[PDB]
Design a protein around this ligand. Structure first.
Ligand code: UDP
Ligand code: UDP
Ligand code: AMP
Ligand code: AMP
Ligand code: CL
Ligand code: CL
Ligand code: CL
Ligand code: CL
Lengths: 330, 330
């Protein structure tokens, strides 16, 4: 609160700033007095998702385009939050080159420009799916990484860390690698390549059965977007985060069948659940992070329960239902 | 010997097959009866470097070009040795995007085509510089990797492993990741971005002082090219190599000043040595691999001593001196 007043009067660039995390993040930066610039190509998000503040400048463009990168970086951002990404697992399996260009060459370009102007922090949204392998012990600790991965998204999420660490090591760029665990909340529009919670909300609110890809006992560590954002904002300002990879998760597990049940309950869906095979790239029956490093370095602590998070997500759906129906990416 | 007769009558694609490793490798495959196809854009090598055998087809082209990839992959290779790379540390620091396209997108394309036709083995030339970090214990063991790297080449060398493991994990591609340690021998032309041994030969044979970037006590594990090739050829056929990363090195250390001394002695250079600062990306005062996994899995054993290797390298230089002078990349 008093912490985040280091953003007041600062120029902050959020690539991917119109998505779920970005929209919530830009809103909070704007409240803290930052002059926020969003760069987003609207490939998975919509302009309507951006919160309306005088001190948010929205720039439609691509991180692969050197023209628009010069346009935003000539503003000389003090902070870059790099949230632009080709999302996610299936999308990357389907389109692995595109995935590499966006997540590999895209971050590299953004880093190169960041080096040219100098930044106080470069905070990259990495992934807990992209680094903890079948041999990593649950709950996942940041040192315990694998290079044996199951999708090109996992590959390129780790690649982004390879690049931020490089720029830290050779050029002393103050980077932070935030390993997000299954983010959910207001601001993720549903669609073919999107996450399960918004799709389950969307299907349940059309009274369709929720398709479970597995037996339902698979777990995730679902982290509410507002928790993620408080994590990110601490990462921008705490010296101790510099050069570190840090999990941002809830630190608790929930079963897919529980999550489906809550969503059916909240939406008064009568159609229940149907079972489908496990997706072939999905080797993870469990994901669970250890958030002790984030507590230590950032005084991070999740504040929003799984249930409260689902309820908030539901409210977002009901309040923007027709817009979500127009916008859904199936 | 009896081992390598599994290559007889087989189609083998060697990307980067005109370089130092590739030229030596293609020659040996040709002797074993393989129908060898080289794909090489001649960016750091020359056509004169390719050994003359009836059963080597040379295709000038780039791994980034989908047309030429269709041309070679329609031959349906049983084996791919992927040696095409953007080389190396300084080159990558200077040209990091180019580096990513060649080492990241290039390997990804080659892997995608390999998946389309099916291969018996996909052997990738990774690097011992690209994966063992400042915290990795010497002698370097294959599990003991870092994601904190010092050049984009190191980054993209590891990226190639990320991709081969992916294709192994999702699509059961029989891959092998060969982590080469400072290769040297006949077939590396000297130049601005090239390795120290050929440049030291070139400078010494022009009676110029050998520039040492450091104090001279820094060590490498220099591995003679013919040893590397015997490693690669075992990797193509041994079931036990499938899915593995395996160091190919000498397993011994030599100081830079020793190496300079030998080269000055061999070339009768009178100009001695001069000292220059450590290159800023070069955090490695020592590199030394553990080759116990290669012994175990491939019955690999270096046969050529450092000294014998330097003498052979020298012979190559004297025998092709004028061609090397025309060809040098400074
Ligand atoms: O339509 C779907 C999509 C996902 N899942 C399950 O929900 C969890 C999270 O899936 P998501 O695609 O949101 O994230 P990821 O698998 O990438 O963590 C996984 O255990 C899936 O098996 C599901 O049951 N039905
Ligand atoms: O012109 C040079 C180039 C390299 N080296 C040294 O020789 C070793 C190997 O350098 P090279 O560039 O061949 O390989 P790498 O550093 O990538 O292992 C290193 O310890 C360098 O400091 C040197 O003394 N002079
Ligand atoms: N190449 C790109 N350039 C700029 N923005 C992008 C690019 N790719 C994806 N995005 C955006 O980045 C955000 C990523 O959020 P998500 O889709 O949750 O991963 C979305 O708002 C996308 O529209
Ligand atoms: N993009 C590329 N496509 C095809 N061959 C390449 C490419 N980049 C480099 N090469 C070749 O790959 C070999 C790599 O050997 P080296 O230069 O020792 O790393 C050389 O013969 C190069 O000419
Ligand atoms: Cl592992
Ligand atoms: Cl601080
Ligand atoms: Cl490390
Ligand atoms: Cl065997």
């Amino acid at each position: 609160m008093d912490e985040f007043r280091a953003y007041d009067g600062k120029c902050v660039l959020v690539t991917g700033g119109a998505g779920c995390v970005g929209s919530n993040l830009t809103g909070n930066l704007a409240k803290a007095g930052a002059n926020v610039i969003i760069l987003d190509n609207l490939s998975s998000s919509y302009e309507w998702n951006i919160p309306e503040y005088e001190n948010i400048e929205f720039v439609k463009g691509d991180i692969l385009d050197d023209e628009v990168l010069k346009r935003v970086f000539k503003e000389r951002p003090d902070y870059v939050f790099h949230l632009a990404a080709h999302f996610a697992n299936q999308n990357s399996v389907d389109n692995p080159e595109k995935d590499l260009l966006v997540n590999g060459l895209g971050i590299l370009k953004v880093l190169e420009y960041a080096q040219l102007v100098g930044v106080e922090r470069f905070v990259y949204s990495s992934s807990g799916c992209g680094v903890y392998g079948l041999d990593s012990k649950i709950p996942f600790e940041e040192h315990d990484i694998s290079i044996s991965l199951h999708t090109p998204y996992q590959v390129t999420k780790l690649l982004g860390e390879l690049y931020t660490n490089y720029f830290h090591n050779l050029y002393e760029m103050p980077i932070v690698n935030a390993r997000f665990f299954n983010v959910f909340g207001p601001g993720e529009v549903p669609g073919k390549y999107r996450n399960v919670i918004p799709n389950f909300f969307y299907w349940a609110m059309n009274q369709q059965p929720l398709p479970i890809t597995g037996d339902g006992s698979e777990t995730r560590d679902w982290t509410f977007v507002e928790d993620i954002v408080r994590g990110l904002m601490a990462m921008g300002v705490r010296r101790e985060a510099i050069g570190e990879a840090i999990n941002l998760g809830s630190g608790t597990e929930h079963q897919v069948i529980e999550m489906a049940g809550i969503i059916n309950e909240l939406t008064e869906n009568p159609a229940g659940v149907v079972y489908r095979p496990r997706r072939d790239w999905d080797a993870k029956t469990r994901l669970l992070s250890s958030i002790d490093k984030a507590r230590r370095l950032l005084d991070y602590e999740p504040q929003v329960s799984f249930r409260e998070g689902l309820e908030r997500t539901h409210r977002w759906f009901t309040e923007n239902w027709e817009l979500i129906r127009k916008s859904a990416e199936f």
